[PDB]
Amino acid sequence: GAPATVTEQGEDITSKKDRGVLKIVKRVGNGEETPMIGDKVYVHYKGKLSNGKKFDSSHDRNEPFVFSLGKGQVIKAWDIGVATMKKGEIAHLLIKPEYAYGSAGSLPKIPSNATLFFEIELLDFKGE
Ligand SMILES: COc1cc2cc(OC)c1OCCCCCCOC(=O)[C@@H]1CCCCN1C(=O)[C@H]2C1CCCCC1
Numbered sequence: 119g120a121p122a123t124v125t126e127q128g129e130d131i132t133s134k135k136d137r138g139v140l141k142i143v144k145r146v147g148n149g150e151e152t153p154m155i156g157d158k159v160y161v162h163y164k165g166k167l168s169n170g171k172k173f174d175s176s177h178d179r180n181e182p183f184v185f186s187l188g189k190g191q192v193i194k195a196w197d198i199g200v201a202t203m204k205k206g207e208i209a210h211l212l213i214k215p216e217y218a219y220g221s222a223g224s225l226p227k228i229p230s231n232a233t234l235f236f237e238i239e240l241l242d243f244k245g246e
Pocket of ligand 1: 192
């Protein structure tokens with residue numbers, strides 16, 4: 119599956135280099151500029167738990183997911199991950215619990231010490 123491929127070939131984009139966030143670019147973006155902290159960011163995504171028991175896509179809500187990058191409004195893996203993306207890029211991220219919902223989880227939606235997988239498309243990003 120795609121998460122296997124990420125565990126196998128994916129780049130470790132953490133600072134501590136602890137493999138808590140692994141990344142593959144699946145479709146290359148355009149431009150050279152990757153969003154700065156504070157930028158308003160527009161994405162589509164598809165997410166799932168490694169346990170295979172919960173899925174979630176922005177498309178289900180029928181609109182872009184929108185957030186301010188680096189302002190803690192998403193899990194840390196997204197702040198780190200999306201900051202590496204270009205306009206038009208699609209990436210896969212595999213995420214250990216320390217960069218997602220930790221040992222507490224977010225019950226019952228995200229269980230304790232869960233690993234997450236996302237496919238993310240970066241649509242646009244604007245200066246605040
Ligand atoms: C759309 O609903 C949710 C989707 C996720 C997590 C949630 O809260 C814990 C959700 O509930 C309320 C929305 C909160 C959005 C902020 C918290 O979620 C997040 O930071 C990450 C990254 C942005 C997309 C949503 N997200 C999620 O973790 C989803 C998960 C949904 C359950 C499967 C794994 C993904």
